[PDB]
Amino acid sequence: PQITLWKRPLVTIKIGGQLKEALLDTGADDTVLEEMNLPGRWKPKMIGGIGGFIKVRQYDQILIEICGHKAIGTVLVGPTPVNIIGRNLLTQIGCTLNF
């Protein structure tokens, strides 16, 4: 599909058997999701943006379905105000910017 940017590019995703709304964010290097109890190992990480940094938990090789397109890679989890799909997974679903 094609998504215009009049509104926030929010889509439905499926992770860990749960459905959620997430922002397709070309400005986010990596995917960061709202707090969730994922199983498996993880590593502490800090990511920065406007306002400073937040501490997150980095889970590796996590499968997420974005609009029926499957994608597997790093997923960060922490106190983010929004579910954010970053470039690490946007590339796997063939998402481009066009103008």
Ligand X SMILES: CCOP(=O)(COc1ccc(C[C@H](NC(=O)O[C@H]2CO[C@H]3OCC[C@H]32)[C@H](O)CN(C[C@@H](C)CC)S(=O)(=O)c2ccc(N)cc2)cc1)OCC
- The residues that touch ligand X, with contacts defined as CB under 6 A, are 23, 25, 27-30, 32, 47-50, 81-82, 84, 86
Residue 84 near a second copy by CB under 8 A: yes
Q: 3-class DSSP state for residue 40?
A: coil
Tell whether the torsion through CA atoms of 22, 62, 90 and 46 is positive or negative. Answer: positive
Pairing between strand 69-77 and 52-66?
antiparallel
Binding residues among 53-72 for a second copy as defined by CB under 8 A: 53-54, 67, 69
Contact 29, 85 (CB under 8 A): no
Name which of a second copy, ligand X, none residue 30 binds, using a CB cut-off of 5 to 8 Å depending on partner kind.
Answer: ligand X
Residue 37 near a second copy by CB under 8 A: no
Name which of ligand X, a second copy, none residue 96 binds, using a CB cut-off of 5 to 8 Å depending on partner kind.
Answer: a second copy
Least distance from C-beta 85 to a second copy, angstroms?
9
Angle at Cα 74 formed by Cα 73 and Cα 80, nearest 5°? 135
Task: Indicate if 25 belongs to the active site.
Answer: yes
What span, in angstroms and rounded, lies between the C-alpha atoms of 16 and 27?
24
Residue 18 near a second copy by CB under 8 A: no
